[PDB]
Amino acid sequence: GNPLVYLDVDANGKPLGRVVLELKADVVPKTAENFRALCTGEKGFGYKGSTFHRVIPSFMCQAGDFTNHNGTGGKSIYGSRFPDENFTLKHVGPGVLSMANAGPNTNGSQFFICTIKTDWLDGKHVVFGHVIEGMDVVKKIESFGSKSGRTSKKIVITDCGQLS
Ligand SMILES: Cc1c(C(=O)Nc2ccc(N)cc2)cnc2cc(=O)[nH]n12
Numbered sequence: 001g002n003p004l005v006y007l008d009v010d011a012n013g014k015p016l017g018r019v020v021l022e023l024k025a026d027v028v029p030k031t032a033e034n035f036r037a038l039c040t041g042e043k044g045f046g047y048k049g050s051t052f053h054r055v056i057p058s059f060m061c062q063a064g065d066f067t068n069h070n071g072t073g074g075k076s077i078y079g080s081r082f083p084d085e086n087f088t089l090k091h092v093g094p095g096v097l098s099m100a101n102a103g104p105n106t107n108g109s110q111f112f113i114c115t116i117k118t119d120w121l122d123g124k125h126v127v128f129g130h131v132i133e134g135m136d137v138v139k140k141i142e143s144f145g146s147k148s149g150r151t152s153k154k155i156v157i158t159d160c161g162q163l164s
Contacts, residue, residue, distance in 0.1 A: 006159075007157045021113075028089065038077065047066055050065060
């Protein structure tokens with residue numbers, strides 16, 4: 001079935017717990033596969049050790065820039081960027097997992113977990129999964145954001161991988 005992956009997240013070096021994400025490979029297989037492999041690190045790079053560098057309360061928590069750790073970087077398992085696979089899944093509410101981008105067809109590795117419905121991102125960001133477990137962790141992460149996105153704690157994906 002669809003991959004289940006996990007992010008174990010620290011804030012200021014103490015574990016918040018685990019976010020478990022279902023990757024909707026049945027809808028966006030290429031996008032799901034990218035994220036899955038970045039979680040396992042099996043291509044030799046990925047999210048382990050990277051940060052939630054942009055967190056906006058009542059919006060989303062964004063992570064995945066494992067190259068520059070600041071929102072300018074990241075890369076996919078396919079190359080630096082890959083196309084928007086489709087926009088079929090919508091930003092329906094908290095827990096939606098969606099690809100950050102810098103315009104059309106600029107998916108890399110950065111992603112965000114919504115903490116609200118973000119319908120204006122429909123058709124602009126490829127949704128590719130959702131939180132199965134650990135919304136409490138997401139809410140913790142969110143609580144360390146700010147309007148500017150700057151985090152008030154260092155939020156680190158200390159471990160990540162695939163559960164199934
Ligand atoms: C809009 C934005 C991004 C972003 O989405 N960047 C981006 C996404 C995907 C790819 N492939 C390359 C760059 C990352 N960090 C921050 C901080 C901030 O205040 N805004 N912001």
